[PDB]
RNA sequence: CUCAAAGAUUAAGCCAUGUGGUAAUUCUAAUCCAAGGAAAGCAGGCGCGCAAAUUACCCAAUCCUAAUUCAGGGAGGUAGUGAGGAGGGCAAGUCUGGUGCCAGCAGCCGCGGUAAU
């Protein structure tokens, strides 16, 4: 007959006001006409509550609404077989988990709120599965039979008698700094006393990690970069069978990023077991052996795959599409402008735009220098390269905010400037700050695509900067900076704390805006693609971090892009069908071959 | 071509009239393509229609699964036989004719694709690039 | 990272049956065989690696290869061998002619021979 | 309590997992693919159906395999899982309230159309 089908309805509180709209909810659902159970109250913590039984999937309370509380979905019963465990009553409740294997790396990839996070915890003992139900007061032989027929089976056995206890790199990298002070006292003592390995291990962990200069600076003191790496110091230094990453890359810089993917593989020869969660594909693909996607609507569910080979996950992941699930988890399929595909015209506008001289900027400790370059109006320059290489330092040079020790740029340019590390400092709501800067801007049907409707900032509106949260204050900031009318408008580091999805929606709002008002943009990054899809020139810095540095006149797209990556020594083929990059090893006769061409990555151009 | 068809594809020689039975090289249970019309084919007194390499077709399967036959349906052609040229000189042909059942959005109905298979259809399908052994 | 096999002339790869006894492939179980992918023994810039051994020495120096020289890890054994590698006649006694390889306890360092055959 | 049969009947149907190069094998001088190439035993799953259990422990026993030992062995052994009737033939007288050839009983014989053995 028909399929089969269910409902599931999840509402969130902070939406939900009973005073304004009255209990609207049981009053309008025509079960509780009839005199059913669909919708009850909960006279305690007063809020509504929808029974997934006698709910008739009508969606006729969601409507009435006043704001948009309440999500009812139809579902084939995909969620029901795989359940796992629940946060509480019509709130997120994860499906399926990841397979850990011994000797290997596997991967996990998906977007914010599917329970990556969740599932490390699971895994490493710290919170108990409910399996949906009431498990609680430690039911750890209940979860073994939920996950009968898996591989994960054992795992749990392992788990619970406690023969290992795997050791969690923590995943929140905005709450520890809070957390920790000294590690206790300075970086160096927390890799002092964690060192169960080899004294060798503690001067080669800090070698390749870049660690030398920041081991006699504080936790609380570091910066986001340098925070990240210090945990993954301890993740080596640690005795153990289990490691688990969860989200290694944040905050780091490509060079970097790329070291700690290294690094964490050598766990794997050791035979020892690893685990870990990316949000970058790069550094996704070199770690793992096997990979793992997770998918499903954020903060609703997140379902677990399962395990794949490393080529075949990342390309089904692009896909935007699974088939076993047979969900199109992603609405639109990301694709990168060939530069065939962009606009031609003749750019120069007033003939070039401001050109800047030779800079210098030495705070004593680190000493950048600039060589001089020109920028033309209508253009975009991606800025690339390791953090303390004075990235952002330039910008801010250029921005006024900063005064050059040599070299000047008075411009007669208005400037629109957007900061790298965003914390919050100002009084007042999200609404009325972004108004302040703009109104109009937010009446833009640009503006309800990319920000409004995604995250659902009126529900934000009333919120406080402090009481927000990372990903979403990115995307609205980014968004304030193109807020305001500037001859030139300055971004730096866009990509930071958001998923797959979020810089996405970033990377066609820089380069739509830029080229439809013929202003210029000079945009700061780590992630390759988003690079590659804004610009039109590059400037590449170079030198050591924490030292000094160099920066570049800027270059067409072909030729920045062969100088970075000739640094990296990583090539990025092309991968036919993906058209994705596709990363060759190090001594190769292909890899070899390529680097007598000198082409380090591919797209829909004429090339060998 | 049309739908689905992501790509525009370069005129090859014809091979194929109306008529002409190819080899179905999926694994759908169709043992042969009979060709009775081609997509985006224009109009000439007289001349019938006829496919190539890359080309959507409108077939029906003669030998074949009994639930397969009697019916029309979308292929695509994917080895040739008739020679055809590329634009870097080359004149060159496929031992047999054969193309594979598909949706009007080009979706391949099986799962595999035996024997080789021309590049200008593997650049044109990717549904068929995915399911490809030798492309060309 | 396939090996070229001496023989086959051709400067492309091939499968071949390979038999206890040969050249890139280690046979698992008496009398396996095996059809193996191999590269042909003719060279080509397909090729990652050559491998070359020197035959005649050229006019100048090689540092890592002309300037260093590597001991022969293990000496005679079966007592002809030692017979031959000193040119000794049936009536010189081996014994004293065997090696003898020093390697230490920390404040006890020894002294270990073979053990002669035949 | 001791003794323990056990997925054969359905589908001998299908199976997750337990000096140098190279994508990668115990590499070697219907699945993974750096597109080149390389790969019906225990438990346990799916399916199937009317129909059959655990991803456990162990060499102690019984013996087996390799050479003068005591190595190996899911052969094997321990555990886990895993017991209606009261009309007649039939033996009960069946008694009291509800039902009316509706609901239901009934292996057959037959019950049931307010007073139902
Ligand atoms: N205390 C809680 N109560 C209810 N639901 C919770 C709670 N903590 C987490 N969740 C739910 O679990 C899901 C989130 O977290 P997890 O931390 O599992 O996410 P991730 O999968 O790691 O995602 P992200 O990439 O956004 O960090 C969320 O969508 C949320 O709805
Ligand atoms: S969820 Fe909406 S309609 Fe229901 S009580 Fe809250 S504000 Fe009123
Ligand atoms: S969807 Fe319909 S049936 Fe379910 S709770 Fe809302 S109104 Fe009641």
Same mark, same amino acid.
């Given at each position: 007959?028909?399929?089969?089908?269910?409902?599931?309805?999840?509402?969130?509180?902070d939406?939900?006001?009973?005073?304004?709209?009255?209990?609207?909810?049981?009053?309008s659902?025509?079960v509780?006409?009839?005199?059913?159970?669909? %919708?009850?109250?909960?006279?305690?913590?007063?809020?509504?509550?929808?029974?997934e039984?006698?709910?008739?999937?009508?969606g006729?309370?969601?409507?009435?609404?006043?704001?948009?509380?309440?999500?009812?979905?139809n579902?084939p019963?995909?969620?029901?077989?795989?359940?796992?465990h629940?946060?509480?009553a019509?709130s997120?409740?994860?499906?399926?988990?990841?397979?850990?294997?011994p000797?290997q790396?596997?991967?996990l990839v998906?977007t914010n709120?599917?329970?990556?996070?969740?599932?490390?915890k %699971?895994?490493?003992?710290?919170?108990?599965?409910?399996?949906?139900?009431?498990?609680?007061?430690?039911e750890?032989?209940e979860?073994?039979k939920?996950?009968?027929?898996?591989?994960?089976?054992?795992?749990?056995?392992?788990?619970l008698?406690?023969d290992?206890?795997?050791?969690?790199?923590?995943?929140?990298?905005?709450?520890?700094?809070?957390?920790?002070?000294?590690?206790?006292?300075?970086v160096?003592?927390?890799?002092?006393?964690?060192?169960?390995?080899?004294?060798?291990?503690?001067?080669?962990?800090?070698?390749?990690?870049?660690?030398?200069?920041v081991?006699?600076?504080?936790?609380?003191?570091?910066?986001?970069? $340098?925070?990240?790496?210090?945990?993954?110091?301890?993740?080596?230094?640690?005795?153990?069978?289990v490691?688990?990453?969860?989200?290694?890359?944040?905050?780091?810089?490509?060079?970097?990023?790329?070291?700690?993917?290294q690094?964490?593989?050598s766990?794997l020869?050791?035979?020892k077991?690893?685990?870990? *969660?990316?949000?970058?594909?790069?550094?996704?693909?070199?770690?793992?052996?096997?990979?793992?996607?997770?998918?499903? *609507?954020?903060?609703?569910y997140?379902? *677990?795959?399962?395990?794949?080979?490393?080529?075949?996950?990342?390309?089904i992941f692009?896909?935007?599409?699974?088939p076993?699930?047979?969900?199109?988890?992603?609405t639109?399929?990301?694709?990168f402008?060939?530069?065939?595909?962009?606009?031609?015209?003749?750019?120069?506008?007033?003939?070039?735009?401001?050109?800047?001289?030779?800079?210098?900027?030495?705070?004593?400790?680190?000493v950048?220098?600039?060589?001089?370059?020109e920028?033309?109006?209508? $253009?975009?320059?991606?800025?690339?390269?390791?953090?303390?290489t004075?990235?952002?330092?330039?910008?801010?040079?250029?921005?006024g905010?900063?005064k050059?020790?040599?070299?000047?740029?008075?411009?007669?340019?208005?400037?629109?400037?957007?900061?790298?590390?965003?914390?919050?400092?100002?009084?007042?709501?999200?609404?009325?700050?972004?108004f302040? !800067?703009?109104?109009?801007?937010?009446?833009?049907?640009?503006?309800?695509?990319?920000?409004?409707?995604?995250?659902?900032?009126?529900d934000?509106?009333?919120?406080?900067?402090?009481?927000?949260?990372?990903?979403?204050?990115?995307?609205?900031?980014? *968004?304030?900076?193109?807020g305001?009318?500037?001859?030139?408008?300055?971004?730096?580091?866009?990509?930071?704390?958001?998923?797959?999805?979020?810089?996405?929606?970033?990377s066609?709002?820089?380069?739509?805006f830029?080229?439809?008002?013929?202003?210029?943009?000079?945009?700061?990054?780590?992630?390759?693609?988003?690079?590659?899809?804004?610009?039109?020139?590059?400037?590449?810095?170079?030198?050591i971090?924490?030292?000094?540095?160099?920066?570049?006149?800027?270059?067409?797209?072909?030729?920045?892009?062969?100088?970075?990556? !000739?640094?990296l020594?990583?090539?990025?083929?092309?991968?036919?069908?993906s058209?994705?990059?596709?990363?060759?090893k190090?001594?190769?006769?292909?890899?070899?071959?390529?680097?007598?061409?000198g082409?380090?990555?591919?797209?829909?151009?004429?090339?060998? | 071509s049309?739908?689905?068809?992501?790509?525009?594809?370069?005129?090859?020689?014809?091979?194929?009239?109306?008529?002409?039975?190819?080899?179905?090289?999926?694994?759908?249970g #169709?043992?042969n393509?009979?060709?009775?019309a081609?997509?985006?084919?224009?109009?000439?007194?007289?001349?019938?229609? #006829?496919?190539?390499?890359?080309?959507?077709?409108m077939?029906?399967?003669?030998?074949?699964?009994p639930?397969?036959?009697k019916?029309?349906?979308?292929?695509?052609?994917?080895?040739? #036989?008739?020679?055809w040229?590329?634009?870097?000189?080359?004149?060159?042909?496929?031992?047999?004719?054969?193309?594979?059942?598909?949706?009007?959005?080009?979706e391949?109905?099986?799962?595999?694709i035996?024997?080789?298979?021309?590049?200008?259809?593997?650049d044109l399908?990717?549904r068929?690039?995915s399911?490809?052994?030798?492309?060309? | 990272?396939?090996?070229?096999?001496?023989?086959?002339?051709?400067?492309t790869?091939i499968?071949?049956?390979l038999?206890?006894?040969?050249?890139?492939?280690?046979?698992?179980?008496?009398?396996?065989?095996?059809r193996?992918?191999?590269?042909?023994?003719?060279?080509?810039?397909?090729?990652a690696?050559?491998?070359?051994?020197?035959v005649?020495?050229?006019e100048?120096?090689?540092?890592?290869?002309?300037?260093?020289?590597?001991?022969?890890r293990?000496?005679?054994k079966?007592?002809?061998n030692?017979?031959?590698?000193?040119?000794?006649?049936?009536?010189?006694?081996?014994?004293?002619?065997?090696?003898?390889?020093?390697?230490?306890?920390?404040?006890?360092?020894?002294?270990?021979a073979?053990?002669?055959?035949?």
């Open positions: 007959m028909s399929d089969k089908n269910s409902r599931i309805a999840i509402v969130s509180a939406k939900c006001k009973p005073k304004k709209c009255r209990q609207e909810c049981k009053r659902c025509p509780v006409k009839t005199g059913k159970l669909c %919708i009850e109250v909960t006279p305690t913590s007063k809020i509504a509550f929808i029974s039984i006698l709910c008739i999937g009508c006729i309370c969601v409507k009435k609404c006043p704001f948009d509380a309440i999500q009812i979905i579902l019963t995909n969620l029901e077989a795989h359940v796992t629940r946060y509480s019509n997120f409740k994860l499906h399926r988990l990841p397979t850990p294997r000797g790396v596997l991967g998906g709120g599917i329970g990556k996070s969740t599932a490390l %699971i895994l490493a003992g710290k919170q108990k599965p409910n399996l949906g139900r009431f498990d609680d007061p430690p750890w032989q979860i073994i939920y996950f009968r027929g898996s591989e994960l089976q054992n795992y749990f056995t392992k788990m008698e406690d290992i206890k795997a050791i969690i790199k923590p995943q929140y990298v905005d709450n520890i700094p809070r957390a920790i002070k000294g590690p206790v006292q300075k160096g003592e927390l890799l002092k006393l964690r060192m169960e390995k080899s004294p060798e291990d503690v001067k080669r962990y800090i070698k390749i990690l870049q660690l030398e200069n081991l006699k600076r504080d936790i609380e003191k570091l910066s986001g970069g $340098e925070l990240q790496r210090f945990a993954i110091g301890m993740s080596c230094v640690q005795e153990a069978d490691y688990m990453f969860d989200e290694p890359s944040s905050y780091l810089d490509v060079k970097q990023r790329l070291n700690a993917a690094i964490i593989r766990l020869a050791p035979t077991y690893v685990i870990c *969660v990316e949000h970058d594909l790069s550094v996704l693909d070199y770690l793992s052996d096997f990979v793992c996607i997770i998918y499903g *609507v954020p903060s609703v997140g379902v *677990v795959t399962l395990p794949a080979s490393v080529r075949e996950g990342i390309n692009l896909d935007g599409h699974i076993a699930e047979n969900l199109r988890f992603r639109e399929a990301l694709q402008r060939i530069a065939d595909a962009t606009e031609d015209l003749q750019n120069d506008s007033a003939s070039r735009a401001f050109s800047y001289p030779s800079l210098k900027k030495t705070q004593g400790d680190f950048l220098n600039v060589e001089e370059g920028f033309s109006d209508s $253009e975009i320059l991606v800025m690339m390269g390791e953090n303390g004075g990235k952002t330092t330039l910008i801010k040079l250029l921005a905010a900063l050059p020790d040599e070299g000047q740029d008075i411009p007669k340019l208005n400037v629109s400037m957007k900061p790298q590390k965003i914390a919050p400092k100002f009084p007042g709501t999200v609404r009325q700050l972004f302040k !800067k703009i109104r109009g801007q937010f009446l833009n049907p640009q503006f309800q695509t990319d920000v409004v409707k995604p995250l659902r900032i009126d934000i509106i009333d919120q406080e900067v402090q009481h927000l949260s990372g990903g979403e204050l990115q995307r609205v900031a980014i *968004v304030l900076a193109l305001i009318p500037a001859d030139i408008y300055l971004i730096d580091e866009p990509s930071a704390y958001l998923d797959s999805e979020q810089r996405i929606i970033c066609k709002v820089i380069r739509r830029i080229l439809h008002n013929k202003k210029t943009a000079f945009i700061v990054e780590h992630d390759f693609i988003m690079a590659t899809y804004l610009a039109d020139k590059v400037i590449v810095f170079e030198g971090p924490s030292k000094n540095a160099h920066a570049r006149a800027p270059e067409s797209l072909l030729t920045g892009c062969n100088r970075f990556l !000739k640094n020594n990583v090539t990025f083929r092309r991968d036919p069908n058209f994705r990059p596709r990363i060759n190090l001594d190769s006769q292909m890899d070899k071959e390529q680097k007598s061409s082409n380090y990555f591919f797209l829909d151009n004429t090339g060998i | 049309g739908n689905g068809a992501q790509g525009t594809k370069f005129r090859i020689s014809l091979g194929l009239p109306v008529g002409a039975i190819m080899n179905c090289a999926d694994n759908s #169709a043992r393509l009979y060709i009775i081609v997509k985006g084919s224009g109009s000439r007194l007289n001349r019938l229609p #006829a496919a190539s390499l890359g080309d959507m077709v077939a029906t399967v003669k030998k074949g699964k639930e397969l036959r019916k029309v349906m979308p292929a695509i052609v994917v080895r040739q #036989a008739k020679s040229r590329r634009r870097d000189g080359v004149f060159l042909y496929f031992e047999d004719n054969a193309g594979v059942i598909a949706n009007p959005k080009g391949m109905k099986g799962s595999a035996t024997g080789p298979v021309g590049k200008e259809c593997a399908w990717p068929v690039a399911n490809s052994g030798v492309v060309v | 990272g396939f090996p070229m096999k001496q023989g086959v002339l051709l400067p790869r499968k071949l049956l038999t206890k006894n040969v050249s890139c492939y280690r046979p698992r179980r008496d009398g396996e065989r095996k193996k992918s191999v590269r042909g023994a003719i060279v080509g810039p397909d090729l690696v050559l491998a070359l051994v020197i005649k020495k050229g100048q120096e090689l540092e890592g290869l002309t300037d260093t020289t590597v001991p022969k293990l000496g005679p079966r007592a002809n030692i017979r031959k590698f000193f040119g000794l006649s049936k009536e010189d006694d081996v014994r004293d002619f065997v090696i003898r390889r020093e390697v230490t306890k920390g404040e006890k360092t020894y002294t270990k073979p053990k002669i055959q035949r």
